[PDB]
């Protein structure tokens, strides 16, 4: 009998290919079903029954086919303040259905608010100190109301729950801040400001299972340090543990490091070792599927 | 030197009175500041600094005074789909500020979506079975789309994140379901349906710290059973543990029990033993404040 | 190369056979080394290096083959209050070497004192109550001194750390108790006494990974109940979790159940599903080796 | 009535004095009973009942006073490979009785084998690396057999479970090692060897609740660093958390640090802040008693 694995990722990565031939316990097979959040819906019952639905809008003359995932691999963000970018209810649905996931549905749900994720890093930074965990000094505003100034400009204003260079605005002076603050008013949501950094380079320390990779972009893969490993291990324990994650830090010309954030299972696969990470992810997923 | 405790509760319960005279370690005092979510705002910095602001709109000619809580006691819900009922960003803010809380800010944040909370109960029901944990068979719909019927009517449709008999609608037949489903469309959010229950009575098993109380409403305080205690202990471990919580179950005339939900630190204090529970809550809060 | 798995079990079970062909990630091979605690020895260094030297003196004087386990499966018992029965320092050694194990080395070490294990069950019985967890009312005596009388006869005296019918003695009266008490003096160790159960039949609820089996003896497999499953799940969480375990309970002639103990990874495989359980254990071990 | 706290410590510290006037919840009183492991005895029953009988033979033959601790504070060491040094069965007894403790009875029991405790530090050193956690490179020998040579001289041989300068021996050459190895044979127990550190000074980073203190000896208090704090926080999480602990490290003449061990609730109070730490311990104990 087989095992269905739903991979929530943009069409771009042919997951069925990578899971080709992998057998759970060396004998059971894995049917790989893949779709984006937008093309999915579901009904979950507390007694156990459920049904996920595929293709709200896509090729195969739409139609919409339901399946029953035994496991889910979420490679896509669940929240985005941009129109239609609200799949949080789908995550809740999957959790309600009791479907095992990577990363855990719990973490995926708690990753829906960036400052909520950053708040975890704040706790770790509090415990560890700047010498161990140089977390940029960000400021969180529940809403633009007391959003009045910035101790040092330029400052980087990150609005709502954004990603992909979006929601980011670099402010250079007081008068320009007040305008962006008024724009934050119209967004009817929270924002954060952080000192802008004159960066010599930036790093991203990733961890997939027990695998660590450090890349430097200015994309040169550099070597891991106990310091780097501390950053990522620390962050990998949040929301009960993150199977796939990375910590982005900026190394300023001044030689000071500043950790800006931690990303979950949606972490974009970068570098030369593309397929390599995809294989690691496959091994991890197959193994968790075997433990169900 | 003293300790400020912010209690987020409606003006109705004079908390300052109950904390009167209680001293941390038998010597430090507790200044009790109390406000509703609506009258509060804050700025939190990753370096540690922060400022909470009181009275967005209230007596004392408003003005707005800031304080610095050393601890928070959240006795109010953080989310409500009704207008202005969105303080989730305040919770995030408090967490960002690193302020200890009861219940934990983590739990308070995860309690913002009822079906997300119910999903935890589903896991426990899955593990334990109906003989140990008779959780009503609820159905979750991410959105009204496949919301087509109900195996048995009447059915109780609970819309969005509601509370206080609001968002609840008892549906008696198919045609009436389809209308409510169309109304769920306009709410642009999720809903749940569950078999309606012909109840002989209902129970609420509460747990405050190590104190358990069982009440029956039809408000008679009844005795605790190992069965009741199992229900509440089980639920008290979710989202990393809930210091104050209760499990509501309906006992149908048919002698079958059905657990409908678990409530957090906002759990309304009921019964005769009103002040009593308030004292227990005070002892718990003072003790957690001492461990900081 | 391949992956070495050391299985600490009597030679009476050919583990290499069961692991035959099983490949980690469907590719890496598993070399199965098997020996008995008595034939094992090692050295572990904090920098990481180590060696587990198997000394099987099977003809040819001192026969020693060095090996380096990647994982351990402990199916034999580590501590026994008898000659040639203390292999606790080997467990410590393996932990010191950092070798992954099933069950965990932590649990295997904490299972070295039966009443210490029973003490965990006492905590669970205190939380759950007799209705949920009917743990026999045993009495622990750190030594013979306080061992003056029993409040029930017959009584079953269990001396120190004994197993497989050893160290157990049923006393029928006061005079006979005082004699056994003087014998406990001579053991220079602790003892426990418990009411004797004139039992119709005894049950053993086992759990290997996510598999549950209930057997009755008077062997005959019976069906699992939520009650049975509660017993074993509860016990499976002790010492940080037990991958393989079982709960033994006696259903007296009184018509009620009595939990007498919980056994770890050394739990004897019984019934007709011996080989099936052996496979379940194999699948579990291979999977944990894959996560290492 | 009041609340009984049994403090297991040598009479050289008048605990009743420090707990004088301290009231649980500002109301309930604390009766402080204090004795030494040797003078203690008990009986514990699974149904809940128990008794801890203090036999202080201070003039007047057999002097016994029964008592029932509500909490225990273990400041004395439980296991010692010497005559009159095994009180492990008392710890088990207390756990069996369900009495709350500081440190936890679980940790006190797992601290009975130094290399078992060291094994935890080895795991942390493996995760963190020498840069973050410079744990001396110790070697564990389950027994004298494999104890053929050391890769560095001088070397420090620590026999079995010894403390307070006991069982430690510095060997300067091969011939002298073989003699000490033959002596380890006679102990019929395990031993460890570690490179000898010609040290300028040794540090001890302590943590009592949320208080950190660093002392240097050549005693002199020095300031805490994020590095120091990392060492102690890391160690404070072992065996489920240690309320009172310290990490001893030697800063050699080589110019680098070496962590040699972590001590539990029996950690000797040193420095000039002995009384301050005694108060910190008192505040911690009273608070945990309040949560019970
Ligand atoms: N505080 C800062 N100071 C200076 N440069 C910054 C700062 N924060 C971000 N940047 C740069 O802006 C890029 C994108 O902003 P991010 O905070 O990473 O948000 P994002 O929307 O996740 O963007 P991507 O997908 O990572 S490029 C980073 O990769 C940095 O090079
Ligand atoms: N499935 C059901 N079948 C029958 N009666 C129900 C059902 N669910 C709820 N009720 C009743 O409706 C009341 C309120 O609905 P709840 O689910 O408790 O929502 P709520 O908005 O939290 O309401 P309160 O504050 O507890 S009255 C309960 O106290 C029950 O008496
Ligand atoms: N209090 C008791 N009353 C009656 N029968 C008992 C009692 N304790 C043990 N027995 C029986 O004796 C068997 C063995 O004693 P246990 O306490 O289970 O330890 P053991 O001798 O190590 O067990 P095994 O199964 O032989 S390895 C049980 O399986 C019971 O059938
Ligand atoms: N490898 C070593 N090299 C050099 N000095 C050492 C070494 N091990 C221990 N020492 C010293 O010996 C002291 C005591 O040995 P420990 O391993 O700490 O055990 P101990 O004898 O129980 O300790 P205390 O503090 O006397 S209770 C340390 O505090 C060091 O100063
Ligand atoms: Ca980013
Ligand atoms: Ca309710
Ligand atoms: Ca047995
Ligand atoms: Ca020491």
Asked if the C-beta of B93 comes within 8 angstroms of chain A's C-beta atoms, the answer is yes
Q: Give all chains having 3 or more CB-to-CB distances under 8 Å with chain C.
A: A, B, D
Please list the alpha-helical segments (H only) found in chain C: 15-18, 88-97, 105-110, 114-128, 174-187, 226-235, 274-291
Q: Is the Cβ–Cβ distance between B252 and B200 less than 8 Å?
A: yes
Residues of B in contact with D291 (CB under 8 A): 209-210, 287
Q: What is the distance between the alpha carbons of residues D271 and D204, in angstroms, rounded to a whole number?
A: 11
Instruction: Give φ, ψ of D112 to 5 degrees.
Output: -70, -10
Please list the alpha-helical segments (H only) found in chain A: 15-18, 88-97, 105-110, 114-128, 174-187, 226-236, 274-290
Q: Domains in chain D, ordered, with CATH?
A: 1-103+269-281 (3.40.50.20), 104-136+197-268 (3.30.470.20), 137-196 (3.30.1490.20)
CA of A107 to the centre of ligand 3 (A): 45
D165-193: b (≥16 Cβ within 10 Å) or e: eebebebeeeebbeebbeebeebebbbbb
CA D48 → CA A220, C150, C170, D69, distances in Å?
A: 64, 16, 23, 13
CA of C221 to the centre of ligand 7 (A): 18
Instruction: Measure in Å the smallest separation between the Cα of A291 and chain C Cα atoms.
Output: 7
Instruction: Measure in Å the smallest separation between the Cα of C124 and chain A Cα atoms.
Output: 24
| Cβ distance of A129 and D233 shorter than 8 Å | no
Q: What is the distance between the alpha carbons of residues B94 and B100, in angstroms, rounded to a whole number?
A: 9
**Closest alpha carbon to D77 in D20, D16, D161, D133:** D161
| Residue keyed to tokens 């967890």 | C133
Query: Which atom of ligand 4 is least distant from the CA of D195?
Result: 1
Q: What is the distance between the alpha carbons of residues B168 and C182, in angstroms, rounded to a whole number?
A: 71
Q: Is the Cβ–Cβ distance between B244 and B268 less than 8 Å?
A: no
Q: What is the distance between the alpha carbons of residues A226 and A208, in angstroms, rounded to a whole number?
A: 17
Q: What is the distance between the alpha carbons of residues C246 and D52, in angstroms, rounded to a whole number?
A: 32
Q: Is the Cβ–Cβ distance between A156 and A170 less than 8 Å?
A: yes
Q: Is A168 in the pocket of ligand 1 (CB under 6 A)?
A: yes
How many other CB atoms are there within 10 angstroms of residue D35's CB atom? 21
Q: Is the Cβ–Cβ distance between D120 and D239 less than 8 Å?
A: yes
Among D37, D39, D41, D46, the strongest candidate for a mutation testing the C interface, having the largest count of C CBs within 10 A, is D46
| Cβ distance of D287 and B283 shorter than 8 Å | no
Element (H, E) at B286: helix B274-290
Task: Work out whether strand C199-208 and strand D23-24 pair parallel, antiparallel, or are unpaired.
Answer: unpaired
Mutate to test the pocket of ligand 3, among C248, C253, C271 (most ligand atoms within 8 A of CB): C248
| Residue keyed to tokens 């004392």 | B60
Q: Is the Cβ–Cβ distance between C259 and C247 less than 8 Å?
A: yes
| Cβ distance of B283 and D290 shorter than 8 Å | yes
CA A170 → CA A173, A174, A249, A252, distances in Å?
A: 10, 12, 18, 16
Residues of D in contact with A226 (CB under 8 A): 128-132
Q: Give the pocket of ligand 4 (CB within 6 Å).
A: D 156, 163-165, 168, 194, 196-197, 199, 202, 248, 250, 260-261
Phi/psi class of residue B248: alpha, beta or left (left: φ > 0; alpha: ψ in -120 to 50)?
Answer: beta
Q: What is the distance between the alpha carbons of residues D222 and D204, in angstroms, rounded to a whole number?
A: 10
* Closest ligand by atom to A80 CA: 1
Q: Is C197 in the pocket of ligand 3 (CB under 6 A)?
A: yes
| Cβ distance of C291 and A209 shorter than 8 Å | yes
User: What one-character DSSP code corresponds to residue D1?
Assistant: -
| Cβ distance of C22 and A26 shorter than 8 Å | yes
Q: Is C155 in the pocket of ligand 3 (CB under 6 A)?
A: no
C264-285: b (≥16 Cβ within 10 Å) or e: bbbbebbbebeeebbebbbbbb
* Chain B: residue whose CA lies nearest to A191: B89
Experimentally determined by? X-ray
Q: Is the Cβ–Cβ distance between D239 and D111 less than 8 Å?
A: yes
Q: Is the Cβ–Cβ distance between B257 and B134 less than 8 Å?
A: yes
**Closest alpha carbon to C231 in C217, C248, C216, C244:** C248
Phi/psi class of residue D42: alpha, beta or left (left: φ > 0; alpha: ψ in -120 to 50)?
Answer: beta
- Please enumerate in sequence order all residues whose Cβ is within 8 A of that of D24, keeping only pairs 6 or more positions apart, or say none: D3, D30, D286, D289, D290
| Cβ distance of B128 and C227 shorter than 8 Å | no
* Closest ligand by atom to B163 CA: 2
Cis peptide before C103 (omega within 30 of 0): yes
Torsion, Cα of C155, C158, C164, C170 (10° steps): -30
Asked if the C-beta of D212 comes within 8 angstroms of chain C's C-beta atoms, the answer is no
**Closest alpha carbon to B111 in B79, B152, B155, B141:** B79
């Amino acid at each position: 009998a087989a095992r269905v694995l739903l991979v929530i990722d943009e069409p771009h990565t042919d997951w069925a290919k990578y899971f080709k031939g992998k057998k759970i316990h060396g004998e059971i097979d894995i049917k790989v079903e893949q779709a984006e959040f937008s093309d999915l819906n579901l009904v979950a019952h507390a007694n156990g029954g459920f049904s996920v639905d595929m293709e709200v809008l896509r090729n195969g003359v739409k139609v919409v086919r339901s399946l029953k995932p035994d496991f889910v691999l979420i490679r896509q963000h669940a929240f985005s303040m941009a129109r239609n970018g609200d799949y949080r209810s789908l995550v809740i649905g999957l959790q309600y259905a009791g479907i095992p996931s990577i990363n855990s549905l719990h973490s995926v749900y708690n990753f829906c608010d960036k400052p909520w994720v950053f708040a975890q890093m704040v706790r770790l930074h509090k415990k560890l100190g700047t010498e161990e965990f140089p977390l940029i000094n960000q400021t969180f505003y529940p809403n633009h109301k007391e959003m009045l100034s910035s101790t040092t400009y330029p400052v980087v204003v990150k609005m709502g729950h954004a990603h992909s260079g979006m929601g980011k605005v670099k402010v250079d002076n007081q008068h320009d801040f007040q305008d962006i603050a008024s724009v934050v008013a119209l967004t009817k949501t929270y924002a954060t400001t952080e000192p802008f950094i004159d960066a010599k380079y930036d790093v991203r320390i990733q961890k997939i299972g027990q695998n660590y990779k450090a890349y430097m972009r200015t994309l040169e893969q550099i070597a891991m340090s106990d310091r780097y490993k501390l950053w990522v291990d620390t962050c990998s324990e949040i929301f009960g543990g993150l199977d796939i994650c990375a910590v982005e830090a900026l190394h300023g010309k001044d030689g000071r490091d500043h950790i800006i954030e931690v990303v979950g299972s949606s972490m974009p696969l970068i570098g030369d070792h593309q397929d390599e990470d995809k294989q690691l992810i496959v091994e991890l997923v197959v193994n968790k599927m075997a433990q169900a």
